[PDB]
Amino acid sequence: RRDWENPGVTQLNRLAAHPPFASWRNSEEARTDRPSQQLRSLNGEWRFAWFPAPEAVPESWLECDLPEADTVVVPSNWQMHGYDAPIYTNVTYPITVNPPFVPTENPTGCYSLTFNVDESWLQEGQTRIIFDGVNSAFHLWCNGRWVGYGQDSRLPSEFDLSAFLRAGENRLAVMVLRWSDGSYLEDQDMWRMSGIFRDVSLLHKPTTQISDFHVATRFNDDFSRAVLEAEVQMCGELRDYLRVTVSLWQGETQVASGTAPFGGEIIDERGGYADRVTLRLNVENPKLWSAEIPNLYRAVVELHTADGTLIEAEACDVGFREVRIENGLLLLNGKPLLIRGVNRHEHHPLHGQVMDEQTMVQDILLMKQNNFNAVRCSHYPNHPLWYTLCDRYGLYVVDEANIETEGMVPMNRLTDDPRWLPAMSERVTRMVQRDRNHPSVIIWSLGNESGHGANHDALYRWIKSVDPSRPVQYEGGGADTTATDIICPMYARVDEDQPFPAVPKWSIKKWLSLPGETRPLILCEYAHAMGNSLGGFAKYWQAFRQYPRLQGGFVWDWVDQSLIKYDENGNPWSAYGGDFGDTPNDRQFCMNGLVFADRTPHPALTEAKHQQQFFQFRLSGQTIEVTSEYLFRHSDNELLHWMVALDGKPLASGEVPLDVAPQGKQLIELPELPQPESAGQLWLTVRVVQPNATAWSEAGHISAWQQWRLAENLSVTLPAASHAIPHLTTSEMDFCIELGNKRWQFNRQSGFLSQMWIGDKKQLLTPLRDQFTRAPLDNDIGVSEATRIDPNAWVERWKAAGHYQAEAALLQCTADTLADAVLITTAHAWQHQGKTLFISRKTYRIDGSGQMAITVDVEVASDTPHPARIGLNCQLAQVAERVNWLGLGPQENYPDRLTAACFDRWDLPLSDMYTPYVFPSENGLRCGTRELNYGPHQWRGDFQFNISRYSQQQLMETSHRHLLHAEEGTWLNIDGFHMGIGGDDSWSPSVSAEFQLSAGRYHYQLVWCQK
Amino acid sequence: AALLQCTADTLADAVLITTAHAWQHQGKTLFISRKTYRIDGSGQMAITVDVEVASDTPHPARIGLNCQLAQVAERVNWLGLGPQENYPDRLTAACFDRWDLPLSDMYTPYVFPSENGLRCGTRELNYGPHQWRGDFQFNISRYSQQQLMETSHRHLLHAEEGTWLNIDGFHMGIGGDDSWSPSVSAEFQLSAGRYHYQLVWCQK
Ligand SMILES: OC[C@H]1O[C@@H](O)[C@H](O)[C@@H](O)[C@H]1O
Ligand SMILES: OC[C@H]1O[C@@H](O)[C@H](O)[C@@H](O)[C@H]1O
Ligand SMILES: [Mg+2]
Ligand SMILES: [Mg+2]
Ligand SMILES: [Mg+2]
Ligand code: NA
């Protein structure tokens, strides 16, 4: 009687969902949130055996352990144990789309556990087992006898084992099916795994117990008073001597407390709930909760007798906060929020989708450290501990039901079918009943990518009836449907409309003012951070700050979903789509994070931190104006740190303490700054510093910064002409310039500098040539594949145009002698099938001081896709340990993603000039560089550059960063101009026009020499 | 305009004059203009300009060259944006083509005299025996920028000897969102710091 193929059966004998319980038998333990004797963990070593289908599971297993089984750790994903491969598919379902049927060959994981139960647990009360997460459906047996069934991989399933357990040894048999009808609602773009991946527990409750409690906090207009309302429901024998006492604790203090017997108010003609009671406590001047200041209280619910005997007690942290959308704005405690959020999948590079406290806290610290204040549980309820952490550390959470069917056609084929209303209903209602008490949860989401069906509207209204305290949102069907309180598009651009039929993505600014529209707009996903991305990120924030109703969004996404594999030698490397024999697979589309699977920041994370600062600065002569973007806190743990520097050389500095009220401003008068003398550019740089360490930050943590170009002094005193003069030698094949020790050679057959010498030492391994292409970035490739080509993607437009295989034809190559320098003039014409794509005219001027002045002037056909770049490149022979440059840094920065970078003198090891993106591509570029120093070399001008041991060619031919091999020497890419990286989304041209090399005619000048 | 350098060299087929000036005011160096004139066998002068602008001096109204020509022709022919006066931030209506008009139509009789008649995106300009080629903007009339800024009414303007030529490699926008406060959009402000344009002067 196949239950995994019937959307009408989502469980069998499963107990009701509810807030986190622990059944303390001591109120003091409850208040202090200390471990509970009535809550045992069944985590550890279990017995596991894999099978090709449930029909292959031998009966013996139900009562007797299979010897063929192995001992494995639980929770875990059997794919991670190597029992079968984890699949990575984006939209296209991993199985054949034929609801509600699943493959006959359904990987079945057989988990078993022998453990014993204290005799005292069976002498009284209720003993139940709790599975926080089983992917994707499963049957449970206790001591050979069958208990129940459950579906929905992201919420806990609980069963009453009281009548199955015996004192002493007991055995659990858990048959977990990888696929099930529930899989139709679990089509998220992530690795497709299975098994018991979340904690297993054993909870003992009294017979007469607390079965549920709801905490609510309502305030007066100025939040000076608040009423805490606690609705409590019980089970078991009802008796008058029964009582419930809800007490509110602020630390060791008891702010309020109320006691009352069961018996609710009259609700209808039949009376009221005799098995419930509501307590209402008053609270004067409550400490409000926010991501800024996570002020919490402790609510302790006690079930006892009138004579004072405790029966059992439950509790939870309470955060006094009011969330409401009013007059088009999302208000948190009366103030309009600006969501600096990010989407976060529960992913571990080694543990699969199994979460642990440590990984969680880590992520949370990183997030807050990079100025994030909100997170979206994309796309399913998260592990229970997570909400607890966000509560205490301070993070606005979007709790999202486990429902995605993006693979269906049309997308709402299931969500609009009343036959599936039941399955969906439970994934929404059970989430609410579980997490509704967490203050960090400020918004409820109905799921992800599932079109817009009636079911969504029905469930939308349910939440609104059940819990008025939180707004509901859903992006399906166009982001502004009748099923959402917030216009929550995903990847809708700032100024550009994407008029798709039925579900267009309007410019977020245009969206707010559409006729009739009045809701607040917060993108549920934006700034696809896939690889070298996040370009144009600053534009979003510029807009968020200017438009009251543009209240932020959630970046996509937090961490790369890469898994660790090992080569023959036993070395670890990051793997993605297909790397497990999984097929069909979606390449590297599972890696869209701001950090690598091991939580190592990507360059882009830094840009995010900067744009999401909570302190804005403006400069007016001598005064720096600091404006606070906080809504509640005062800048009581910050001090401004300034410093003036002439092209890297510091001159003055100081530090003023910050005393800014939320929303307020503070003026800082810098002392008569040092009057520069030497030629150069003076740069004022301010940094906000947190002197004291917090719960999430180290001491001296930097929360914000900003630069300003002070005065400038154009150098007029041109160089003192040296008396030496370069000598020009002429072959029929070469032009050789010699000066003292240095030797220059221009191959008259190419028109390029083929070699240089500093003594009997060669300097180049590859001629110094022009370059107009780049190792395609993920954003340049989009969804274009080997067999399926997307002619629109930048990479394809370039390929087709012939940029990647252009033959450089020589038009001219002459040499002349001047009063004090040799002058080589070149001129090339890159073409493809006749079409002249680029023309590069240059003039090299080597003078007495031994400096080579390269002047380039390029032309680009006004009918050939704009080049990825316009510069020069060559393979240097040396391999130095450091790289020093005066320009934007220290981290990788590109035209459309360089706001965070600062202008100064930077020095780093050659390796840090290379960004280890799992999928290799153009990287490590640094813009606005006036001086570059590598080995004996020094390049001067106003260029961009990237320097590493990998050629653009290798990079574009290599698929994984671990297959990259260092090459002889160091590859230098010096660009006069570089196209933006884009990133508004990674599946369609997303580079803003102002960042496209389209000028037609470009000009840059370089000065090569020996330092 | 202080002279920093002015040298001449001989090449395999052309003379090469290199200049470099530093416009200042009370010590402060406002602009630096490096140029190289290349007159070759075909008798064409190739002027290559490379200007620098102090990143702390109000963005210049323009970046070009000018001189008072001796001739006074009846027509003006150019390949670029026209036929009417057009500026960077107000040239959408103009079309690219070959335009020919009488010298007078290259002057806009605004009652209150000011910079006028500019034409952007010009690749070829023909006046009298002259022809200028490149990718510049220009305005050509019988009134000097100086007279124009010293004169209050268009009827007090007197034609001057010859024809004044203003060839800009870059011209700041005219603005107009309102006429009582800076109204020129940032993208139209000569702020790049370093500019570069090239011209070819010759006889048609
Ligand atoms: O990067 C692709 C993304 O597309 C979004 O629409 C979806 O909600 C995400 O879960 C992910 O699939
Ligand atoms: O989620 C929105 C989009 O995400 C992309 O990754 C996918 O290739 C598209 O087909 C669409 O699903
Ligand atoms: Mg079922
Ligand atoms: Mg998806
Ligand atoms: Mg900025
Ligand atoms: Na806003």
Ligand code: NA
């Ligand atoms: Na993705």
Ligand code: NA
């Ligand atoms: Na402070």
Ligand code: NA
């Ligand atoms: Na005037």
